[PDB]
Design a protein around this ligand. Structure first.
Ligand code: ZN
Ligand code: ZN
Ligand code: ZN
Ligand code: ZN
Lengths: 209, 209, 209, 209
């Protein structure tokens, strides 16, 4: 759990994210909780040129290491960590289906039982605010209160979890749910959903196993 | 036909399933008929970390080997084997087009002559029940009575066949049919289909060759 | 131009066809004109297990070599060669967009200037007939009279050209046109097209260069 | 910055363009500003057979080197360079989503904040004219006046930037925006957009960082 190991996992997570087709437009950024702040990807460097040394440490005060420029979206990664103490990693991307659903400004409802992976019966959509602002950070923080992933209106996705592996897995699953919702929405509106009772059973079953 | 050989084929089938784009969300599971029960993939292990030793034997009583946790969806694999004596392998996934059609709760009708690969003029959609339950297992068993593949409402797909190669092939073909049906459904409802007579000719022709 | 060289190109064409995403469902078949008939892919053998020795020679009488089973769809490859003397290679697949357009039973009109690659202002759709029949062969032959590619209703695509490279290229371009037509058809009906005069200019320009 | 180095980058850009799924139909062409004209890809040679020696120099008078045939679309690459003095590289392709939006003859409006990457609140669509003509070149030149990328009606996309890396990046981002617009357009018309004020803030923020 030295800095270098966490740094390699961030980079591996970026590469896997691009392999999976979630990092369309080179827009993603990934962070892990570390010491009193976080390790995040830098702005301006293509994912394929990234080395351990490029990863940027940002303390709990928001001061970043000298000589390195963190992601232009670092502020809501820090909002995530302060809003969800259990989160140890954060994945953000502009994946196409998640983003199209966020353009409609809709939340994804319970069209599939795997929706319970993010914590409840839906995937919320936080209202728009300019990227990098304190206003965007407050919407994200309120949205992650009872959910581990959220859409950002006219923007993309944020997913958090106990480690990078699980955070990537969740981000990917939300992209799948987003694609299921847009494919069926074009056929019928509204789309059939599972009841709240049904989702409460699945949630208990996921706690158990 | 030793256990290890069947175990390698299960793992190879998972990898090919992911290559083909059918294992979106790491949700699939694969089994083969063996001795008095089956060999199935374990729960919790990413497909890329799988080794021969991870494959779990489950007997005809439903008891699994000590120290190994089988897939959380093993029960309907055992339903498949008891309902279709000719089936020797079972592929289950949450492939995006199959699953979107199952969210609409529709069966796929005869829009293409290859529909006859699963046994008749359609691909049914079994009613929803919580994953891992005996109720889900009964719907699956009734649906596979006269068909080799079925959709599961709000869930995904199950396909079975005489060996893994053919079961993967069928699962993939149903995903193609699902995508053909959703693409044309967005344009026109209902979608043009081939008549029952026409499908009976194709079925006879597939018996012959 | 020995048989073995043509045989390797057929196999390479299958592999490239699968790489390009056009051979969904393992359904394609490829042939080249040779001697008094053709060399075609065999039925039953997965594309990745294919070797030079598997390629089947079928003479001008329709008799195939002893001990080898040609594609179940060889008959319309032979129809293509008798209907278009200039064709030296034939690619057939069940590519998803081409096939969805053939399910609607529509021809692809002039939505893009590259439509002229197949010879005119459209891509026709030949009426359905059972696969492998003489009736299907007659529709295909009439459709290829003034066009180098055609859709087959409820079925797929046939493209022909002077060599395999160009035949693959055309097949791929028709899949792109098919996808352009289904994407815009879901938004507006009918889709804007280029005039007949405009296509006549492009056709002359393609003759020139 | 010798000719050979620029030539390798053109070729690498073609390969990456095909990897990204933007060069559907082998239709793209790439150029860089050089000396008194440009270096462009040749017509007729598949991207995978390209070598440094194939790259064609075209002077400021439009005369190309002896013995080499430049792209059939070289003329609007030269229009781009004369219309935008800051552009040093030009990427053109027939990417499927960009092209479908150009078939509708619509401009892409501000559905996402990344729209500001091409310079304003939209991605224009230049009117159709036959490929390779002086009339097409004038529409392209007028469209790139205040934008770094444009759609071409019934045709495709042109993107320009200070170097190939950035030009590819922009072309790819416009394909993502195009796909976001067609996916949401099928659900609702018109699609929600960000206001002009909001885009002016983002534009200033991109100048800053
Ligand atoms: Zn972002
Ligand atoms: Zn399942
Ligand atoms: Zn066929
Ligand atoms: Zn072009």
């Amino acid at each position: 759990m030295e800095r270098n190991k966490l740094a390699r996992q961030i980079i591996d997570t970026c590469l896997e994210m691009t392999r999976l087709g979630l990092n369309q437009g080179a827009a993603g950024n990934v962070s892990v909780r570390y010491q009193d702040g976080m390790l995040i990807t830098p702005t301006g460097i293509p994912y394929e040129k990234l080395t351990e040394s490029h990863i940027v440490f940002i303390d709990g005060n928001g001061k970043h290491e000298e000589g390195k420029l963190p992601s232009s979206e670092w502020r809501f990664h820090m909002a995530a960590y302060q809003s969800r103490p259990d989160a140890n990693a954060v994945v953000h991307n502009h994946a196409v289906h998640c983003t199209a659903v966020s353009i409609l400004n809709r939340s994804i409802p319970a069209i599939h039982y795997m929706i319970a992976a993010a914590g409840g019966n839906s995937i919320p959509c936080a209202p728009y605010a300019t990227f990098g602002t304190r206003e965007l950070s407050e919407h994200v923080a309120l949205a992650l209160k009872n959910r581990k992933a959220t859409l950002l209106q006219h923007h993309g996705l944020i997913a958090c979890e106990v480690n990078l592996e699980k955070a990537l897995w969740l981000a990917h699953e939300v992209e799948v749910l987003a694609q299921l919702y847009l494919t069926t929405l074009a056929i019928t509106d509204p789309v059939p959903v599972l009841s709240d009772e049904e989702i409460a059973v699945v949630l208990e079953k996921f706690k158990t196993y």
